[model samples]
Target chain A: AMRQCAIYGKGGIGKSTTTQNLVAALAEMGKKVMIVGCDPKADSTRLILHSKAQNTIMEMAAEAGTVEDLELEDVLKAGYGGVKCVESGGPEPGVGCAGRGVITAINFLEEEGAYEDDLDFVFYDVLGDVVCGGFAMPIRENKAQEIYIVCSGEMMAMYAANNISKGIVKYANSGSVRLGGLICNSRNTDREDELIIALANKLGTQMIHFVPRDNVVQRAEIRRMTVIEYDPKAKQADEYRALARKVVDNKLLVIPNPITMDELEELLMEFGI
Target chain B: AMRQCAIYGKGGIGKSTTTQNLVAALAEMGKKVMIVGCDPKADSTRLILHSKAQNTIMEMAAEAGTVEDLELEDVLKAGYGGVKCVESGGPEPGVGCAGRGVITAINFLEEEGAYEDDLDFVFYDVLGDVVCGGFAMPIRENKAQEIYIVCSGEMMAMYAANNISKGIVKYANSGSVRLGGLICNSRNTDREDELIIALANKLGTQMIHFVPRDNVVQRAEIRRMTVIEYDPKAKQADEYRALARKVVDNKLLVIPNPITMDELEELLMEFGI
Candidate 1:
């Protein structure tokens, strides 16, 4: 059974790195995994592939002239621990829309049968914000049922998390995509963990994991590997493994209740940040 | 007279230039004109403002806290030929939803009385593709009664034109945004004029104007002026003037009969390009 999950959050947040690391941990646990980097920047699969960048689905689609002519083999790349990876590239800077790229790439994936039953997990690491219908393609009806929002205690990150829940509200009303939980990527703000926990409570979800600040993540990235891969003995590797276990065993998925801006701000102030 | 017009086109088919030139012409005729750049990219006001960029309504709204707090003076700017300009700026590069930006900007303008009775014309230069509810800010019920689609003889442009008509059909039942005609910004191809004429016939509109390939327009643009402004003596300036007059005095408006993708391809195949 292929369990599809989509990781979404604000830009500059650790969504891509967090998703990659989590998938790597799953792969290590003998779960067959696929990571779809649904971003023009194409960094989601970089650590998995151990390459500078993976040839993206959108680039291949454009290269084949039209998206209709795309093939799965043309874009999908298998990386470490047999982790299948695909990145959705976008148009050149300041030109065409990247959101359209995300849409075409996902449709092409569906057309060419990337979602085979052999896969235990398929992770769609989307761009920070849901800019258009294309970027929201992952969490559509009957697609990725579990959504993990990576956020910190920072005001913008929390705002983005709340806004993303509102986006979830859009599809959750009609589909299976639900707020699995919030992944608090530690910005190490004062009382950060408690703040995100409070946010998750208000949003009617749980704080699935609190990955504390660790220089091991940076050290692993310098070696183009997940901490789970670079140094399994590293303490941070245990944290990611812990997150992977929670994801695999999660049972509390529910349609999210995204709160208003005022509500979110109040929660932040309560944490006294 | 508060004559509101909207320029629609397939993305990247020169809707902005056509709209700016037309507004310049209207301004030259002593019509107090305002160009509301409804696209999130906010390039709509650049041509008229002659500045690198102008502050947009949505960006200001985001900065000043919310749309409810923003005044018209905060975003709207005065440009060349006394053309009033405003852009509905969206998320920077790759974040947030742009369609929401358009919706928020337009709603702000409406609530704050951006459209005064003293204003002769309000032109909404919209995004190339109106896939979502946000990009359709211009063609809302009873907003822009006259819609001129800037198209050429390209297959994609024709496809976009048909898609736009489909959008029109959706809103036509409730709104006054009708297909005024197709303004052909000539690409200097074989049967360019005939192709758009055929498309116009198929869509139940007219080929209102054929803007020939002219260097004077580019030359004038280098001076940050319209053809009519930079070189009034130029013949191309007269063409724009003629178009302006036709637009000012014209009364042809109809809910379009948009063709299917297959039918659109068939139409393009007929043109042999």
Candidate 2:
């Protein structure tokens, strides 16, 4: 049985890095993985693919004049761990909507039979904000059932977490998409652990892992490899493995209580931000 | 009672310039005129504002951190011939939905008391391509009683006109935003004028004006002014004045016959595009 997962977080909060590392860990456990970067920027699969950028289905469709003219092999590419990769590319700057590009690309993927029966897991490293239905394509009815929000005790991260919950609430009402847990990539603020745990508690979820602020992961990223892949003996690699272990056996899923903007502000205040 | 008219059309046809020039002609007729740009691009009032970009309600709301902190005066700017200009702008590139931004900006403008009794005419220069509710903001319920679709002999423009009629049908069924007429922006195609006249006849409306394409209008756009303001002595200026005259004296408003996508394509085929 294949388990599809998506990682969402605030922009510049190491969502791509975390997702890459986690997918690498999953692959290390002898799981066949495919990573779909559902972002216009198309950086989601860079670390895995070790490539500059993959030509997305939309980009190819645009070049060929329309999406109906595109084929599956025209967009899908292979990356590290033999991970099948695809990016949903977008229009030239200031011309068209990128979210529309995501929708078009995902529909193309589905039509072209990209998802195979043999794959154990499919990872969607989506853009930070799920502002529209296109960005939330990963959480659609038979797509990614588990959503792990990479957040921290930082105010913006927590706010993003809440916003992600709001997006989940909308999908939960219509589909099987549920909040798995929060992966706190810690910045080590005062009471950081407790604050995120409390926030997760309020959201009807849990902190699955508290990843510490470390330079080792950044060093590994420079080599275009995950911490686990670069140094499996490192403690940070063990942290990722533990996260993989939790995700492998994880069963907790719920419709989260997405707090309002004011409620998010109150959460930040409680954290002295 | 002054009429609040909105012109809907496909992109690349001239809704903004037509509205501005017509409003400029209306101002010359001693009618107090205002042009509200409900489009996110904010290009509706450029000919009137004579600026690179006018401030928009959504842009201001984003700048002030939230829509709740914005004032009507912040978005509504004064332009040529005392035309009060307001633009419902959108979010930054690849960040949020431009449609939702238009919705939010219009709601903010209404809540802030921008509309007044002293106003003689408030023309909404809507963005061409009414693909969503955001672009149709001007035609909702009691907003714009009369709608004029700017079209040409080109098949795409005719298709856009029919699609806009579908939008108007929804509004017309519920409210007073009826299809006033079709204003032909001549592209000088083979039998262009006759084709649009036939399209209007098919849709149960009149061809309100047949605006001949000319270089004089382009010359005026270079000066960031309407042809009426740039050179009232110009021949095209008279055509716009005539259009305004017809609009001011117009009484024919009808629920239009909107066609299916296939039907629109068939009409396009008849035009030999």
Candidate 3:
């Protein structure tokens, strides 16, 4: 059975990097995967494909007159270990709606039978902070049922995580979508991993994986490659592999018990975040 | 049958003022009218009702649990000449969607039989340009079909009028909606009325009325009253009466020919506006 998941977090929280690396690791495990980049930046798959930003669905659709005028293969690109990638491109800065671009691109992919392939997993690398209805397209009905929120122990990052959980609970209350777990992309804060774990426990979830701060990840990013693909033997690559393994066997999806602003601030104070 | 109309223009072009005064004139002429203020400012009906601001449908809806919880008479208020008034209130500055509030309030009116009151006219006094679909809700299916664009000969005002025509063209192409005419709220620009008439001619519409710049309007607005009611014998009061008579007897509604950028600038330069 195919499992669809979405990764959300605050901006600059290493969500795209972590998602691409983890997808690469899953591909290494011989599982067919497809990544839908839901951000206007379209940087989610560059590391996995070892290339610059791929041509996005929105940009191509604009150029080709409409999304209906293009074939599925035009937007879908093959990356490392045959992991497929697609980006929901958007307008240039200060122009059209980036959120609407996500909805249009995702609807295009679905109607074009992009998910009909014999894939084991489909990952939506979404933009940070569910800003609008279009940005929430990934977790809507008949889409992603499991959502992994990536965050650090930083104040703003955890704040965004809780805010995102509130959005998740709204959908979960009416649909099947739920928070799968939290992925701690360490920021070297005091007791960062423990803080994330404790926060996740309070939200009735778990810290599925803790990806430590590593220069190898940055080194690989500079080359437009994931650590797993750039250096398979790198310790950072093992971290993503471990995350992939945990995700493959995880089934603890639940409506997140998002804490109040006061509770969040208290948690941050306890960890000195 | 109710003749539903929407007034759209630039943000500061006095759309609400023209709409309220026109409604008052229509009321004096024994026409049953309702003014639906779509702006968040909720100032559209203030002059007609001679109040600070009418209690909006959305605000009352929120306080009473939902829009469904209120009776039709709760949000609807009778103003000068027994003209009906309702404002679609929204979030404070820099908060929630004012456009969506317009859609919700208008839909509520439709479902609750606000339009079935034997009204000769239901003027949707919209704010600014047609920037979003929510603001365009008045002209959507089964709603307002006659669009009167309030504008002046100023550069930005003419530009906004042109853009609003484009929006009308989009809806008119698919629905019964069409441009009624342009209401020139004069800013004392050089050859303002003549310039608007020329621009309206190019756009395949008429300069329905040219309301001259007058201190009586401001004087009446200060007292939250339209010139038609503040002093029916005032010269400016007759101007609104003339506008209302034309609107009542008017029949010209066509898909507007929005002029090109160069043509618009050419007209503006010709009039030294």
Candidate 4:
């Protein structure tokens, strides 16, 4: 059976970049995958598609009068390595719920039979902060069960990750959604890997992978490409491949134990010196 | 006259940090100021209050059954320099619009006559992303007319600021909301000041002040204080004092001309080489 996973990260954590790269690596490994970009920004699938943002489901629906009028083919597009891509666009500026937009897009996809056979993975690139129910829709019940958060060593980054785990704890207590692991997107902080690993331990999950900080990632990024797609021989490309392999063979999922503000501060302080 | 100004910034931009520091400086100048924290996180007034977080209006409302039963004295608390602080707390996890929470909090405040004479200034430290009408409540007609966005030279930061400008355009065309200027919360990016100034020019606004990133700011933060109050002699404190003076004399508010994605990319590319 195909596994549904959602990638969550706080803002400016390079969540979209990591998601596409990981998806590309998995697709290269012969695993059929699909990415559902869930944000108002809609730039989630660009690196995978070798293009700018694709027309999102909500945007297309708005153009066609309603989501019911949009065909599956109208919204879904195949990108590099045959990975399927679709974005659940957000509401118009200053108009409605951003989360509600995600719900609408997902409902439309379900009615259109977007999830079919031969799908090894479906990744929901979600907004890290769960301000409302709509943003939390993906991991609600029978949706994405395995949650992976992309974060860094920065205080704000881990704080965002911890905040996300708190949201997961709520749903995980009453449902099947569980935290898979933390994908550490390094910011070159002091002992960054060690800090994230410690954080992962506290959260009852592993620091599955620590992608190092390198200018090569940005070099590929500016050209609208992932390291895997741009240069497979590159070391950063291997990082994503390693992350992809671990995710595929990974069975470690559990309810996270979020720490208090004092504990979080103590942990950061411990790493400071 | 009480000038209502709202500080806006994308995630991880140190918005709350900048807001409280600026407010602290203004307060030191003998101007009465109030901060209305409007994010679900509710950490906006911490530095000012010298506390982790105050009991937000929403959380108190939940305990009291409704906002109708709450009093102004219950939610409003005095912080450093006698700055009045209040947070329009977010909704419960996985329920309702975060924006609606802001709306409800503001409605309650208005009903209680929170805006009294000799206020000098009322600052709404809001979530930078304007996802819906609820988040945009502060900038609607007859509310915060002067808006300042705290951003860095990072592409994601500028993208968010540009996106917010689009939202402002909608309200500005039909309402009194205007983009006051861009506050560069520096990340020490190469020629950060130059880049932000260029971006400000493109948006038809000024780079009002470039607050350079410094460890002293973070040092004071770990102790629950803004630089102005924590160490009045610190250079970082001087930056905020300067920013406050500029804001006080600022008269360049305008309807922003948001840039296209291609234009944004072109600008970033120019700064690259």
TM-score of each: 0.56, 0.54, 0.54, 0.96
Q: Give candidate 4 misplaced runs (Cα > 4 Å).
A: A173-175
Highest TM-score model number: 4
What digit string (tens of lDDT, one per residue) describes model 2 on residues B1-273? Answer: 767788877654778889999999988888888787765546788888887667777767778999888767767787778888877776532235545666786577668876677778878766544344466555654577888989887655776687667667765556688888999998776777777877888899999999999888867876789999899999999999999999998889998887654565455557654
Candidate 2 second chain TM: 0.91
Indicate the docking level reached by candidate 4. medium
Q: Comparing 1 and 2 by DockQ, which wins? A: 1
List runs of model 3 lying over 4 Å from the truth.
A1-61, A64-273
The local distance difference test score of each candidate is: 0.77, 0.75, 0.81, 0.85
TM-score for chain B considered on its own, for each of the candidates: 0.93, 0.91, 0.96, 0.97
lDDT of 2 by residue, A1-273 (tens): 788788888655668778888888888888888888776556677777776556777767778988877777777777677777888765432234445666776677778887788898888777653344466566544467888999987665786687677767766656688889999988767878888898899999999988888888767765667787778899998888888889888899998997755565567667763
CA error at residue B142 for candidate 4, angstroms: 3.7
Worst 10 residues of 4 chain A by lDDT: A91-100
Ranked candidates, highest DockQ first = 4, 1, 2, 3
Give a tens-digit lDDT track for model 4, residues B1-273.
689998888877888998999999999999999999987778899999899888888888999998998889999999899999998888655555656778888888888999899899999888875446467787664478899999988887898899778878877657688999999998787888888899999999999999988899879989999999889999999999999999999999999999988888888888872
Candidate 2 ranges with C-alpha deviation above 4 Å: A63-71, A140-142, B1-99, B102-273
lDDT of 4 by residue, A14-93 (tens): 78988999999999989999999887788999998888788888778878998888899888999889999999888665
Lowest lDDT 10-residue stretch of candidate 2 chain B = B91-100
In the range A1-273, model 3's lDDT, one tens digit per residue, is 789999988655777889999999999999999999987557788887787778888888888998889899988999899999998876432133445677888889889999875999999987653334456666655378888989888666776677667767666646687889999999766788989999999999999999999988767866788898899999889999999999999989888898865687678768765
lDDT of 2: 0.75
Model 3, chain B only, scores a TM-score of 0.96
lDDT for predicted candidate 1 compared with the true structure: 0.77
TM-score of chain A of each: 0.95, 0.91, 0.97, 0.96
> What docking grade does candidate 1 earn?
incorrect
